[PDB]
Symmetry: C2
Subunit: 265 residues, 2 copies
């Protein structure tokens, strides 16, 4: 009886305003809304007010911070910490499951070397953001990406181990089915390793990163869904993807597909 | 109905000769023997002769190569490749499931940096190793170790992804329960990620790396065993560990404990 809690990033639903998109999401029973972190503090009232009376809640906050935490430049690491804290505080007000963060993209250089001593440093920095997140009633969430976008953190099991070592309820992780296609031999095993640390999930079609279903037989999430069920996953599965067809047609088709696959898992 | 195929490294069983140790192994129904690869070519006759008429086969070959494949010194990398090929040919003559290899230990320096370019080079080298091993009816087996011994390759999911990318019937991976204690949030998840590439398993007590059971309640392999059953694992589970107590008492106890947990999984 575990529920699939679907969520959408802000650009997913058709509509000319935030309220039109939310109406569309309510029609489909999509219960999570995932905004970007950019300017979030200034959007708290807008978002709260649009959600009032709806069966929709803020799920994760997708990034939005400046700089990156593995820069060799302490000023850039501080920029990342400071901008993350601004977002975290707004995320807390919005009841968010947490703020998504990539430690370093490929092109974010110069970066600290990929060594154990750097990993310890990352864990310390994340412990500091997590303590702040927890005070604000939220978390920070490591996102692994595939090799085309990052090398540092690519697999859910790696992110989960970081979280276990940090041992902070404000420090969690996630898996993105797009990235997992390229970096996980098993979506199920990855999510199982995620376990109690798995705070969010991203979903997209698995060849073109468009709406689930637009890549036909490649868009198979059953193995991952079996992992989510085995861990009792109770957070959101949120769309982060493009769109090839007519959004009024393909968005509902994606929701239908994920629900069918959830039932089969 | 999946069977647990127990194996011992050479120093596990009590005895003053290889034949005495094998006699002890047969009495406990341990069917796998795991010798080190050091001077293996020169022991092929010895091992064949000792195994004649016995219900014991060679399982994996534990390392034995010189140098390391991630050295910045081409001569050291070549030493690794050349000595691995010697061992691989002997492994094949002995019907081994594969030769275990760690890309780089912490003290093996200077080493290539942990970057995507190094990962590509590692894949090229293992592909060469694997083509040779397949020709000889065996494999090479990546072993992830914990942070106290290595940084480069620590998790089963990472090793499995290397195997998937290399895509060679001669290149496989393993999990060692000792190392997994420190590097895996889920033994089940780790082995599920291992999947079709999982070729061997090491077992030890989980606090002091001694005989299973010597660390009491910490010596729980159920979760991992569930993962092995879920993937239809049909290779060996091999003891690589020390011994705190009377070897004549604690070795049979460890075998008994593992068989009990396997039945519970
Ligand atoms: Mg994502
Ligand atoms: Mg081992």
């Amino acid at each position: 009886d575990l529920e699939l809690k679907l969520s959408f990033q802000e650009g997913i639903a058709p509509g000319e305003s935030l309220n039109e998109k939310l109406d569309f999401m309510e029609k489909l029973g999509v219960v999570g809304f995932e905004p970007g972190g950019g300017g979030l503090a200034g959007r708290v009232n807008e978002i709260k007010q649009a959600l009032n009376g709806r069966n929709i809640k803020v799920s994760a906050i997708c990034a939005g911070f400046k700089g990156f935490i593995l820069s060799t430049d302490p000023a850039i690491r501080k920029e990342c910490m400071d901008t993350m804290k601004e977002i975290i505080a707004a995320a807390g007000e919005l009841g968010s499951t947490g703020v998504i963060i990539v430690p370093a993209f490929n092109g974010q250089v110069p970066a600290l070397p990929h060594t154990m001593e750097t990993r310890d440093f990352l864990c310390e920095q994340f412990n500091e953001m997590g303590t702040f997140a927890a005070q604000h009633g939220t978390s920070v969430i490591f996102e692994p990406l595939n090799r085309k976008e990052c090398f540092y953190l690519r697999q859910v099991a790696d992110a989960a181990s970081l979280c276990r070592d940090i041992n902070n309820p404000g420090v969690r992780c996630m898996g993105d089915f797009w990235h997992m296609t390229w970096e996980e031999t098993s979506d199920m095993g990855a999510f199982i390793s995620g376990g109690e640390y798995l705070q969010h999930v991203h979903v997209a079609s698995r060849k073109r990163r468009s709406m689930p279903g637009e890549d036909g037989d490649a868009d198979n999430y059953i193995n991952g869904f079996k992992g989510l069920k085995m861990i009792g996953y109770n957070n959101y599965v949120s769309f982060e993807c493009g769109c090839q067809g007519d959004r009024n047609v393909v968005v509902p088709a994606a929701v239908k597909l994920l629900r069918e696959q959830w039932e089969q898992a």
